[PDB]
C-alpha cells in the first residue's frame, strides 16, 4: 500500500491587481491513493465556475490542476482547500498575494 500527501500550490496567473482579470490555480500533486476533495474558496464560498484536468496518474502519482478565471478586489480573500486520508484534517491553503 502507498500513502502520499497531496502537494498544493495556490498562484494567480500574473501578479494580482485589484480590478484587473487573471487566472487563479490550485495544482494538488503526488497524493496517493487518488481519493481526494479539492474547491477553491472566495470569501468562505465554493466558486462554482471552476475548470479542471481529468484526474491522471504519474508513476512520479495523482495530479489535478483546478482553475478559475477572477478579478480580485482589494478584501477579497482566496484559498483551495483540499482532504486526503494523508491529512489529519482538511487542509486550507490561502492565495497569498
Ligand atoms: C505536478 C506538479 C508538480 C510540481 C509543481 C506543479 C505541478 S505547479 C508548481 C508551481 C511552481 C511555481 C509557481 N509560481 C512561482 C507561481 C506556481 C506553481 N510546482 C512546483
Ligand atoms: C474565510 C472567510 C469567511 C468570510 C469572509 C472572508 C473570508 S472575507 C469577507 C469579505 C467581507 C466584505 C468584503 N468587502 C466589503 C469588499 C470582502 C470580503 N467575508 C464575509
Ligand atoms: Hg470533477
Not at 475548470?51 to 478579478?71: A, I, M, P, R
Amino acid at each position: 500500500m502507498i500513502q502520499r500527501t497531496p502537494k498544493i500550490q495556490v498562484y494567480s496567473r500574473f501578479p494580482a491587481e485589484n480590478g484587473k482579470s487573471n487566472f487563479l490555480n490550485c495544482y494538488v500533486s503526488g497524493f496517493h491513493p487518488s481519493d481526494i476533495e479539492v474547491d477553491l474558496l472566495k470569501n468562505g464560498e465554493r466558486i462554482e465556475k471552476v475548470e479542471h484536468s481529468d484526474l491522471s496518474f504519474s508513476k512520479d502519482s495523482f495530479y489535478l490542476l483546478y482553475y478559475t478565471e477572477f478579478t480580485p478586489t482589494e478584501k477579497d480573500e482566496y484559498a483551495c482547500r483540499v482532504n486526503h486520508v494523508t491529512l489529519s484534517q482538511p487542509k486550507i491553503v490561502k492565495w497569498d498575494r
